[model samples]
Target chain A: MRPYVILNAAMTLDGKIATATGSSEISGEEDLRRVHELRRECDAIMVGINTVLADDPRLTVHRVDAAPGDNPVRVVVDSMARTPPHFRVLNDEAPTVIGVSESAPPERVAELRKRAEVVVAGTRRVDLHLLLERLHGMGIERLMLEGGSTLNYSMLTGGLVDEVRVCIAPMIVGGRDARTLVDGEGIDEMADAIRLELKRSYTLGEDLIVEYTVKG
Target chain B: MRPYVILNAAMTLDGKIATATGSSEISGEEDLRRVHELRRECDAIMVGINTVLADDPRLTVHRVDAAPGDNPVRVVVDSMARTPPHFRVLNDEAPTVIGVSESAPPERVAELRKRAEVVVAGTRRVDLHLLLERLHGMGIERLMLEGGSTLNYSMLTGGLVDEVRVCIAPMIVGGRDARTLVDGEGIDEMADAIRLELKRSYTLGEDLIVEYTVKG
Candidate 1:
């Protein structure tokens, strides 16, 4: 069994999370508060290795008022255990779980285990299904999937995500090579797309929040 | 002076117009009718050579009921005069305008001129500003920009687009190489992104229509 997962992100009106150069200041202050509240509510927050390497997010509930214990556990899907030792996600503000595969270098895995709990999953890549089951076993009932596109695609296609929330800013940064909300091997036809039921939508500051439930 | 331009498209919630393999059968019947209605309302509809070669659209008001005169003029931005001679846009259903660049082969331009009006603009590319000015001179007061990503970027960055109307479908088909609503050499920073003011947003069948006015 796996924990209930909610995927959340902020993107431009054209659906770009960041430009080709990685300039990703998209959402307003109100949305940041909302995200922080969400982090505080979830039992755990997860991201892929690429996100940790690119943005080095803390994955803590720091944007809003919170007690010391309000921060959720941080989880990283690092197949090769490549997360840097000094990344913010490994700070004392929250516990961290690093999922790795058998192909991960023994030295790297041992190095990461010094500061974070390491879980071995797949052979060549982190089996998202198995990793999530381990996360569930750790009592992470609610998990927030903070994405950098690749992980979003894997979790979504593996039928792990339960809900999706996107904050769209009123701007257009067009680029063919820019990062979008989900970017993996896409389905060949729209008929095979992952369907969703629009649950809620609202305006927050200069952004619009659109929420949807993944439909079976 | 250029004509008033509206860039319109139907994209998935993840902001993809088509998957990597070009499967773009998005939007419902209701959205299709809305697009045809938009076509009937505009004085002309324009698209790029890639769109013509990829989809071979007729660019006519065919999805809804209308008189023979309701079909707007069809325009194609073909810098190399690459629009196929037998494309539906060149039919007798409406007047056709082919915009090419100075580098376009004279033989190809001469062939296209047999059934359409060919206008030369930029040195190596179809200067969207000059093309829009020529269309304005030809009485195209309101233009609908049907895109294939590249032209949308060119028109938008050239400050030729006045508005944007996108119908977001409740589905996610993620691909790193998929086409988005606007795809060109993008701005590096989000602070430099093209700003927009939300004008209207409403539900249209299973899709959501979000309209924005381009800000100066």
Candidate 2:
């Protein structure tokens, strides 16, 4: 069994998370605050290695009042332990975990272990199942999966994502090569599509907050 | 000068108008009625040639009460006069006009002229500027440009669009090859992006209708 995973993202009406060059500042101030509040509510926030490499996010709750231990544990799925040493996730402000594969270099693993707890979770690529189980074993009841499309695609098609929350900005970024919310090899037929039921939709500032639950 | 153009479409939160294969039933009955009502209010409903080939929409006010001449004039931008002679727009249910480039064969123009008013509006592709000017001269005060992306992109970038009305469905159809609301060559930078000020956003059936006016 895995922790309940909630996938959250901000995208354009065309589903693009970023432009062709990976410049994504689609969220407004209220959307950012909403995300931070969700971070405060979750037990952990998991992201892929590319997300860290691209965004360099702090992965900590900000713009909201919180007490000690209110911050969620930050977890990174890096198959080869290639997370840069100077990355913001390596900061000591929050408990961090780096899930890597057995194929990770021992020296790199040791280097990462110096900054964060390192867990070998897969044989080649970090197995999502094993990583989730390890995270659940740590008593993380809720996990927020913030992604860079590929991870979102994998988690979604792997039947791991339970809910999706999207803050849609009132704009259109129309590049055929742009990155969308789910950006791997997509499904073939409409029957193979992931079905979602609308849970709630409301306006948050100038953006529209739309929520949906995945159905079998 | 040109008619006051209001561009309308139904898209997913990801900005996709249809699936990879061009299947586009994103609108519900309520949304469909809303579009028909807009058709009733406008002097003419305009669409690209590709739209006619794909949907074969009657371009009439349906599912709503209408009297004689309440049906808006149907206009098609067929640069080559390739609209099939038996197409739905050829029916006598509404007054129809086909705008074509000068490159169109005279024989084909005469064939189309038998059924609808034919206008040579451009030299290569039907010049949107000339077509809009001719349309304005014809006393079309307001035009509804319903599109299939390429036309949307052209009109938006050409600065012909005044307002945009979109009904966004809750579901996401993830495909790299799918059709978006505003395709064609997209803007390169945020500075070049088509800016829209949020006019209003409200729920329409299970979908959300967001309105925006193009900002200078």
Candidate 3:
């Protein structure tokens, strides 16, 4: 059975997923809480090693009106076991999974496994096909990939994601570094794309938050 | 002797001089008038071929308070002789001097010369230094360069610019493509061994405009 995976992103109007060569904290609270709410509904929240290292997000549910445990699992994809044991995700109560390449060093896997659930699932190229298979067997019925552009493109190209939620903020960062959408992967003409149905749009803290779900 | 040049530009809070991948009517009318006043004090209003192609600006000075004969020349550095004869800068009363490379078809340069002044000043490189010398010989005291990035970078890196006026708009563009201030070759560690003194700090329509001059 295919696990339902939600692909969500926060981007500037110019379409830059990140600021030029660095981090820029411009996302307002509304988008932040939206991600938290989505986290509450998913069994696992997955991101790549780059996002993990750059954001160091505490993948926990912090609700002003609700308590924890509704918090989702935090999963990171790191082939070399780059995440140190002192990371907040490793120290948290939520179950954590580290998806490593099948070729990762045995000793390094053992060290990562001692801290979190180490899954030998991806190939040297980091296969997403086998990843979903292993994730489903682990009882993750639903997963949410909160993204950086690298992870976003991987899922889009891999066809692993089932839904997309995007928020449009009222800001501009003009050019490839500020607002550029994507770099070419040299992929052939795309498959009939998964149509997205605009589910909702609202004003949240100077941001026009919009939600979309897969349609057709 | 040729006086050193300066290039000044201001942006908005989101690091945008205009909108995304497109130009917006960004500068306010008050700022527009102020810019014209500055133009009247200079010898030439210079820009690059890319700016002319992208913006198609009519570099004219017409303020309700200013008198005639005070307008500076509209100058374009088009080494390849690319500017169309129909460009508005050619039609305006202000004289235009298009600096083209020596290899450019002299006939095309001669054709453009009918509408405005055209000079073959540079060789394979479009001689910026010689162009400055000729401008000084023409009794032009101060030159103003308002060109695109490559031209701006060339001038600043070439040590042709003695002063830079920057109006840093207070906002972060999460994307890295755009720069807060125009920069060129000069760095001694992170600081560039440079210090700036703020000349003015004021607000315009929620944007905090900070103007600073560099003391080298």
Candidate 4:
């Protein structure tokens, strides 16, 4: 089986995770702390390669009163093993895993293995299910998928995500090209919409935090 | 001077007001009452023609203990005077006004005038500024715009709206074609984004209601 995945995002009121320029500093300081708290509770933090290309997130519990080892393992789903050698996730402060597909070039895998552990998951693209199974085998019972939208969509549509939490900022950045929380091959009809049960909601600093459980 | 416009909407956590099919049964029963209470507080309720064509809303304070006359004046912004003659807003239960452009077809205006007062506001499109001035002159001191996104975008980008209140349901509808609360010619850069100050947020029957005042 797979690990329980909690998908977390910070978006504007119009559901944009990032503006047209791929900048998403929507969450305030305290909201970031809330995100770090979620990271503290998870076994690993997963993000797509596009997120790595856009924002080189550390995936660390920063500013919180925790040791360097307190940070969870950083996992990146990079199908072609295209993660830059100098990416922040390659930093030695924490354990890092790069999941790529079997089709990734052997030379690229060898180049990446010098920095982080590499796991081949699928044929042409990184198989999310296989990655999750391997991550579970590695004892990652709880994973937090902090996203850049496309990865969130994959996890959600694949039914691998068990929870959703979002802290919405009090602003509206309306752009047709802006990226939202979940952007992928969306379901066409309303009857295919995913069902969610509201579990909790609260105000965190200037943001509105909401939590939901994916209904079976 | 124009009235204080409170732009209101009920949306999913991902900011969708309705699915791709335009079926907007998003709000719960208690949230509906809250919406009606806001209607009772406003002097007029405004919407765009697209909302009328899509939802055919009565714009009434239903299931609330208020007299028929207590209902706010219903206002529709239809630039082409394209509102159907037998629309529910023209049922005579309350006062109604249809704002059209100065270039509206005379024959169409004459047909609409049989049921509701028709006002010419702009040149080729319903000028929001002129409509607000006329509405103010008619003693509509406080107006609430219930929208279909396009109107929300227009009023918001035109800087005619003063406040925003959204009741967010805890569901993630991930269709790219779903309608959001504000859709318009989005700003090019984050520096030009609309800024809002969080006034308050509270839980409303499995929904999170947030209120914000536009920053000067």
Candidate 5:
């Protein structure tokens, strides 16, 4: 069994999480509080290796008032075990897990294990299904997916995501190479796309929050 | 002076208008009807040359009952005069204008002028501002922009767009190479993004329609 995953992100009106040059300051102060609150509620928070490499986020509950232990477990799907040891994710803020592939070099995995628990899953890439099952086994019942686009696609297409909540900022940054909410080898036909049911929507400050339940 | 322009499109939840393979059937029947209604109300409808090459849409008010004159004027921003001569945009159902650049081949412009009005604008590319001013001179007061992403970026960045309306379908097709609602040389910083004021939003069929006015 996999954890109940909620994929969350803040994007521009054109659905860009970051501009072509990697400028990602999209959401406002209220949305950051909202995200931190979500992190406090979830059993674990997960991101892709690209996110860690790009943003070096701490993935803590600092945006809202919380106890030190309130920070959820940090999980990173790094197929190559490429997370830098000095990265903020490997700090002493919270427990961290690095899911790597079997093809990942043992020395790299061993190095990652010194700072974070490294779990080997797929043969080439981190199989999201197997990783999620392991996370579920570890008592991660509810997971918050703060994506870098590629991982979001893998999770949603693998039927690992239960919900999606996006804060659409009142801005437009158009770029063909920009990072969107989801990006991978996409479905060839629109009919074959993963569907969702709109659950709720509201305004948060200047941003609009649209939430949906993944259709089974 | 330019016409009051409204940029309109129907995209997936991930902001994809078309998948990597160009599969674009996003919005449902009701939304199509809504689009046709908007078309009937507009003085003219505009699209980029790539849209003509990719979709070859009729750009007519056919989904709803309409009089012969209900069809709005069709405008194609074809910088190179690349719109195919036999395309439906050249049909007699609507008065068509082909906007090209000064760099366009004279022979091609002559070929296009045989069927539609040809307006030369910029040096190497169609100057959106000049074209919009000319369209205003032609009495196109309320212009509906039915885009193919590139034109959307150009119009929005040119500050020629006054309003934005999008039907977000409840589906996700994630592809890095996929076409989104806006795609061009994006702004480097999110702070410099074109801002909008949320005006209205509603559900139409299985889609969500979000309307915004471009903030000055």
Candidate 6:
């Protein structure tokens, strides 16, 4: 069975997640808290290698009253084995696992396996479907995806995404050419399109949380 | 040339038109007033068979406290020849045009011609492109489409819908069965899809007005 994947992200008013050069730091404090709540409620949390390498995230679920084991499995999809060893995701408090492609070398992977669980899901590109199935095998029924846009686009354009949670930050970054949450140029017809069916909308401080699903 | 079709709609917080399985009602007073302002701004107001038949709408921009003659044209895409003459469309104050396909015969259409303009757009579906071209040929720069899911889906998927003005009402219809504003299945791949760029969003009496375009 497919696990429920919730794609959570934040962006500017212009649908951009980062500046034109793939750089950004626009999330508010509430966005961070909402991320913690997602970790508390979800079975696993996942991100792309670029996000892990860039942010050096520990992938730990933050607690309010100091709960011991921060929740959920921390997973990353890194097809090219680009995750650097010094990334904070490898920390002990909130460990990180990497989803590798079949093309990943056994030796290099053996090294990562020592740091965290390194699972092979697919080849050429990490098969999100197979990765989800594997995640289910790990007893994870609900997954949360925090993205840097390219990964969101990968899942969305692949039809692998099940839901979208967008947090609209009040601040506007001046770059009109920022990287959007998703970018795909090949498809050009509405006959092949998915419209968002909004499920929830509320404000978390200055941030707005908008939930959506595939428009049926 | 195309008849500039402006789609106007309002929904609740959960993106609902009315209660589950219930017809749409004027839920918010402010939104109702906004509708009047929109009606005054457009050259025509229109709906499809499902909307026209279900609501039997008066096709008038009432509550604006304006002259009856200020109402825009009432247009309907009735390719099935299902609209009965007793319908409020025929009993309208302004010119009620029935946009029929080629299947609708000229002789039978001559009857509707007496009450409203019977324009044959195409043979099967209302050829929006051809119809818009004709409207533009007649020097009509703007048109409005208020419809059920089918027409909105048609306009959206056909890439003819350039701008959308949506009013988000504060309500929710539960389950996976809520009727969507538009309908269509998108591509099955993540790397190929239609993406929306935001134009604007604001709260209109607890309702969110979301405007979008096709971009990053």
Top candidate, metric TM-score: 1
Give the best candidate by DockQ. Answer: 5
By lDDT, highest first, what's the ranking? Answer: 5, 1, 4, 2, 6, 3
In candidate 3 chain A, what residue range of length 10 has the lowest lDDT sum? A184-193
Q: Write down the TM-score of every candidate.
A: 0.99, 0.88, 0.54, 0.91, 0.98, 0.55
The DockQ of each candidate is 0.87, 0.39, 0.04, 0.48, 0.88, 0.03
lDDT per residue as tens, model 2, A29-143: 9999999999999999999998899889889997787777888999999999989989999997799999999999999999999999998988998899889999999999999
lDDT of 6 by residue, A1-216 (tens): 667888888864334465545556655687888778778788788899878876687777763432666567888999866777667777776656789998987777877888888888887788888888888988888988887665766776666667877776543232223455554331232223345566777777656678877553
Write the number of the candidate with greater TM-score, choosing between 5 and 6. 5
Task: Give the Cα error of residue A31 in candidate 2, in Å.
Answer: 1.7
Check candidate 4 and list the clashing pairs.
none
- Candidate closer to the true structure by TM-score (higher is better), 3 or 6: 6
lDDT of 5: 0.94
Fnat of each candidate:
0.84, 0.31, 0.01, 0.47, 0.84, 0.00
lDDT of 2 at B214: 82
Q: Rank the candidates by DockQ, best first.
A: 5, 1, 4, 2, 3, 6
Residues A27-136 of candidate 3 have per-residue lDDT tens digits of: 57877887788888888898888778876778878743445567776888786777777777786668888888888888877887887888776667456677777888
Tell me the spans in candidate 1 whose CA falls farther than 4 Å from its real position: none
Across A1-216, the per-residue lDDT of candidate 4 in tens digits comes to 999999999988878888777767788899898888888888999999999988887888886777657889899999999999898988987899999999998999999999999999989888999999999999999999998677887888889999998888878877666787877766555456677887887888888888899988
Best by lDDT: 5
What DockQ would candidate 6 receive versus the native complex? 0.03
Range of the 10 consecutive residues with the lowest summed lDDT in candidate 2 chain A:
A184-193
What is the TM-score (0 to 1) of candidate 5? 0.98
Error of 4 at B168 (Å): 1.2
TM-score of chain A of each: 0.99, 0.97, 0.87, 0.98, 0.98, 0.90
Per-model i-RMS in Å?
0.7, 2.3, 11.5, 2.1, 0.6, 14.7
* Residue A193 displacement in candidate 1 (angstroms): 0.7
Candidate 5, residues A1-216, lDDT tens digits: the string is: 788899999999999999878899999999999999999999999999999998999999998899977999999999988999999999999999999999999999999999998889999999989998899878899999999899999998888899999999999999999999999988889999999999988999999999999995
- Which CAPRI tier for candidate 6? incorrect
